[PDB]
Design a protein around this ligand. Structure first.
Ligand code: FEC
Ligand SMILES: [Ca+2]
Length: 309
């Protein structure tokens, strides 16, 4: 019998006409203003029109399914994609499993770190849909940044970039490790998210030749409350002011694909800052559907399945 593999991600507009309803969904059903829509649409336009996140997420979910099924024959996995803010929604994926007769599923979020605003909400929605339908039972993975192959993947990508920096400028190079920002109040309740990112930065740093590093956040939202900082743009300016770094290497390790928050918030907004101070910009390829990353996810899911049984 088959075990459902519920692969969850944020979602992205398929078409330009979808941007309004996607943004409305992000804002809990409250339609943004015309100025807010125009600004978002202009960011998608700046990165080429739309984001490739849709096809990357699919390649990741079906590449993971194939890696799992080609590596063993104790069980057959069947992947279902459930998205947070556009169809197929999380609830649609759970419905489809139930209608297919899946009785047992493992879920994974395509974000390696846990927080109350991200993975918690994914898991709450998946379990609430399964409770109503009467199945499947969902066994959730909460985080997986500690996976050794995950850390080694990012260190290899950073070391390949650093090898193309001149040896006499490596001492003036800094590795900026980042994730999506969240409201700062999550620290008041000891949410694990900021600690998990610091841990990820520490594990990577001990495996790369780059001698300096700093932790930052990015892509904070339009609210009137404080968000986790420093922002990667502001941190770049500060570090140039104190240390005069010549090379900035940005690894937004909270993300797993090349989407709007990397293509715009790093490759446009951070490059604007490195240009202003006169430093070089580097941003290694994201994991996307590269086989080494599919192997990270296969290890994570197969270890989860091994520990249930
Ligand atoms: C955490 C976290 C992740 C990583 C975990 C996971 O991937 O789900 C995360 C991942 C992503 C990814 C990719 C994308 C890119 C989608 C694509 O079109 O390329 C992506 C894109 C957007 N996020 Fe995002 N996120 N995000 C928040 C937290 C997280 N976010 C919070 C909080 C709010 C604030 C909600 C509100 O305003 O009340 C919020 C709002 C937006 C908007 C709305 C427009 C704007 O104002 O910027 C867009 C577009
Ligand atoms: Ca921003």
């Amino acid at each position: 019998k088959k075990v459902g593999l519920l692969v969850m991600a944020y979602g992205t507009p398929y078409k330009d006409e979808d941007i309004e309803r996607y943004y409305t969904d992000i804002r809990h059903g409250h339609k943004p203003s015309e100025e807010m829509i125009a600004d978002l649409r202009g960011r998608y336009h700046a990165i080429g029109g739309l984001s490739p996140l849709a096809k990357i997420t699919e390649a990741q979910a079906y590449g993971l399914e194939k890696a799992l099924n080609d590596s063993q024959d104790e069980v057959e996995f069947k992947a279902y994609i459930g998205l947070k803010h556009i169809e197929p929604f999380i609830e649609d994926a759970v419905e489809a499993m139930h209608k297919d007769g899946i009785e047992e599923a493992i879920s994974i979020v395509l974000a390696p770190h846990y927080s109350s605003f991200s993975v918690e909400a994914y898991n709450k929605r998946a379990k609430e849909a399964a409770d109503k339908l009467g199945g499947p039972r969902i066994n959730a993975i909460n985080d997986w940044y500690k996976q050794p192959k995950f850390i080694q993947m990012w260190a290899d990508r950073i070391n390949e970039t650093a090898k193309q920096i001149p040896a006499d400028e490596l001492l003036d190079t800094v590795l900026i490790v980042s994730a999506a920002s969240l409201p700062e109040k999550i620290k008041q309740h000891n949410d694990p998210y900021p600690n998990q990112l610091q841990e990820t930065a520490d594990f990577i740093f001990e495996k790369v030749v780059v001698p300096h590093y700093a932790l930052g956040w990015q892509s904070e939202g339009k609210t009137g409350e404080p968000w986790l900082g420093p922002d990667v743009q502001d941190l770049t300016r500060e570090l140039y002011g104190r240390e005069k770094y010549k090379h900035f290497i940005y690894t937004p390790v909270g993300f797993v694909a090349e989407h709007l928050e990397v293509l715009y918030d790093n490759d446009y907004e951070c490059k604007v800052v490195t240009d202003e101070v006169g430093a070089a910009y580097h941003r290694p390829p994201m994991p996307n559907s590269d086989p080494e990353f599919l192997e990270v996810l296969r290890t994570v899911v197969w270890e989860k399945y091994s520990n249930l049984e």
